[PDB]
């Protein structure tokens, strides 16, 4: 069972974590792994080998935070390391449903693609809804004065905090709660990698929560959004016969009443049982002429042929 491990950044000095992050930056994601990079790739490691790379203090920091577990003879990590877009991130290893804990954290399935779709501009205050590992928040922290990440999974909140400390980031905060409840005030930027995929209307789990989580999100967005703010959402959308997602969305957003502009970029689609249609896409709320537009953008395809330059893309 994966994703129930205890994560406790609060039990380590901020400096020790910052140094560990420095060490990880040198090796995570690079060829010829050192013992630290081996540890964070899921390989058990002799602790004296770690000692020479992170110090005995670093070694004790790894234990105290929950990043490492002492199997007597060796150390092992329940987490896996990533490095991308200027940040080091720990998350759960990519494993199948049957062995996931209820607090399993998104193992960065779509993060790198999503970061590349995001408008490159920065601003005053950003919100990362369902922050998971915290990866989107950490990237946003570089160009926002402050960033709040929220999740209902307490373990995601702890991991997010740890990941911010590892990167020595000071302007990013994380709170446990349900949707917007722990997010006070308005935001000039809201990003939401939604937990929607194949489940349609039905709650399966925190990573497939059903369409209602989008309804809640979009019904409340208008009161959480600063004038001129931007909203970006990864989501799965179900068009049913005589019942397109986009009409439900416009209803939720009070589109004309609140005077918002929404663009939906569809990347993938398939026919469904109903004679309806499933789609995956990227939704953007941004200042301009009121209304809703649908465009095609096979960014998943383009990401596969050449990741390194979708790019963005939406700025257009």
Ligand X SMILES: Nc1ncnc2c1ncn2[C@@H]1O[C@H](CSCC[C@H](N)C(=O)O)[C@@H](O)[C@H]1O
Q: Is 195 a residue that touches ligand X (CB under 6 A)?
A: yes
Taking each continuous run of H as one helix and of E as one strand, the counts in the chain are: 10, 12
Q: How far is the CB of 88 from ligand X (least distance, A)?
A: 15
Q: Could you give the CA distance from residue 138 to residue 172 in angstroms, rounded to a whole number?
A: 7
Q: For residue 263, give both structure tokens.
A: 């663009």
Examine residue 202 and tell whether it contacts ligand X (CB under 6 A): no
Q: CB atoms < 10 A from the CB of 65, how many?
A: 24
Q: Kindly state whether residue 196 participates in binding ligand X, applying the rule CB under 6 A.
A: no
Q: How far apart are CA 286 and CA 118, in angstroms?
A: 12
**Residue 136 lies near ligand X (rule: CB under 6 A):** yes
d(CA 63, CA 217): 37
Q: What are phi and psi of 249, to 5 degrees?
A: -60, -45
Candidate residues 165, 207, 253, 264; the one interacting with ligand X per rule CB under 6 A: 207
Residue nearest to ligand X (CB): 130
H or E element: which one contains 249?
A: helix 245-253
Does residue 150 interact with ligand X by CB under 6 A? yes
Residue ranges of the annotated binding site are 97, 151, 178-179, 193, 205
- Binding site for S-adenosyl-L-homocysteine, by residue number, is 151, 178-179, 193
Contact pattern from residue 255 through residue 294 relative to ligand X, giving x for each residue in contact according to CB under 6 A and a dash for the rest: ----------------------------------------
Specify the residue for token string 């301009």. Answer: 288
- Closest approach of Cβ 164 to ligand X, in Å? 13
Binding site for ligand X (CB under 6 A): 106, 108, 111, 130-133, 135-136, 150-153, 156, 178-179, 193, 195, 206-207, 209, 213
């Amino acid at each position: 069972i994966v994703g129930g491990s205890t994560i406790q950044p609060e039990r380590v000095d901020a400096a020790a974590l910052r140094q560990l992050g420095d060490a990880m930056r040198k090796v995570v994601g690079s060829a010829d792994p050192t013992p630290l990079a081996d540890l964070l790739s899921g390989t058990p490691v002799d602790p004296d080998e770690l000692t020479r790379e992170v110090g005995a203090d670093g070694r004790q920091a790894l234990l105290d935070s929950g990043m490492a577990v002492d199997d007597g003879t060796t150390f092992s990590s329940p987490l896996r390391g990533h490095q991308l877009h200027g940040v080091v991130v720990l998350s759960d290893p990519d494993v199948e449903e049957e062995v996931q804990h209820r607090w399993y954290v998104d193992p960065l399935w779509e993060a790198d693609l999503l970061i590349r779709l995001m408008l490159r501009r920065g601003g005053a205050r950003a919100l990362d809804m369902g922050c998971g590992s915290g990866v989107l928040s950490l990237v946003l922290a570089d160009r926002y004065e402050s960033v709040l990440g929220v999740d209902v999974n307490p373990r995601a909140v702890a991991l997010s905090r740890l990941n911010a400390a590892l990167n020595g980031l000071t302007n990013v905060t994380f709170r446990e709660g349900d949707m917007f409840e722990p997010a006070e005030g308005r935001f000039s930027r809201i990003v939401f990698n939604s937990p929607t995929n194949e489940e349609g209307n039905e709650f399966v789990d925190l990573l497939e929560a059903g369409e209602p989580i989008l309804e809640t999100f979009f019904r409340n967005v208008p009161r959480k959004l600063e004038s001129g703010g931007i909203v970006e959402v990864n989501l799965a959308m179900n068009d049913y016969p005589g019942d397109p997602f986009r009409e439900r969305l416009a209803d939720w957003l009070g589109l004309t009443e609140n005077g918002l502009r929404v663009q939906i970029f569809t990347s993938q689609r398939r026919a469904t049982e109903s004679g309806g249609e499933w789609k995956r896409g990227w939704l953007v709320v941004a200042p301009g002429p009121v209304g809703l537009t649908e465009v095609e953008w096979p960014y998943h395809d383009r990401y596969e042929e050449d990741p390194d330059a979708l790019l963005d893309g939406t700025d257009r």
